[PDB]
């Protein structure tokens with residue numbers, strides 16, 4: 137099973153200038169809980185944005201060019217990325233935009249955080265078709281002293 141996990145600001149913005157400009161610790165904690173002990177697939181730009189391996193997860197990087205760090209696994213195609221995960225129950229695709237586009241048709245589950253923030257960005261989450269997806273979990277949170285925007289955690293499963 138392939139799942140995508142992402143945090144979206146208004147208008148599906150996910151990034152600007154190879155960064156995420158907001159800071160929502162509760163959402164990073166949600167990301168860690170839902171990815172720990174699973175393989176994570178990311179594109180090369182997202183690998184450079186994170187800047188280090190994510191502990192407790194098999195890190196698989198898509199790039200057309202040879203890898204430059206043996207602390208992670210480098211692959212050259214979608215099919216190779218999936219194969220490198222082995223026989224696990226759930227593969228987590230953690231972006232970015234180009235990678236989400238390619239894995240969306242293959243995904244059975246989306247873990248989405250909707251952030252009430254207006255962000256200029258240069259990268260968007262793919263347009264998906266709402267009729268294809270059932271919302272099975274949602275949890276709204278107001279802003280607090282640690283999280284400066286309101287946010288909604290949602291899990292969707294392909295119908």
Ligand SMILES: NC(=O)c1ccc[n+]([C@@H]2O[C@H](COP(=O)([O-])OP(=O)(O)OC[C@H]3O[C@@H](n4cnc5c(N)ncnc54)[C@H](OP(=O)(O)O)[C@@H]3O)[C@@H](O)[C@H]2O)c1
Nearest residue numbers: 142143151154155179180181182199200231232233234235
């Ligand atoms: N809000 C969120 O949830 C979230 C999550 C993740 C990322 N982001 C943001 O998203 C942005 C990065 O997204 P992006 O769309 O620019 O880049 P990306 O999807 O992270 O990386 C694209 C790169 O991945 C490689 N790649 C992708 N598909 C491939 C394939 N089929 N075969 C081989 N290589 C492949 C290529 O590397 P080469 O050029 O080396 O071939 C391509 O240039 C940043 O702003 C980041 O902060 C946000």
Ligand SMILES: Nc1nc(=O)c2nc(CNc3ccc(C(=O)N[C@@H](CCC(=O)O)C(=O)O)cc3)cnc2[nH]1
Nearest residue numbers: 141142143163164165167168186190191230231249
């Ligand atoms: N919901 C969601 N939020 C995100 O921030 C997110 N980020 C990415 C890609 N970028 C990043 C950037 C930083 C970390 C990070 O520092 N993670 C730590 C945080 C643990 C914590 O804060 O409690 C980790 O171990 O996962 C992960 C992914 C992909 N999907 C996402 N999905």
Ligand SMILES: [Mn+2]
Nearest residue numbers: 213214215216
């Ligand atoms: Mn091939």
Ligand SMILES: [Mn+2]
Nearest residue numbers: 219222223224
């Ligand atoms: Mn197998």
Ligand SMILES: [Mn+2]
Nearest residue numbers: 252253285286
């Ligand atoms: Mn806001």
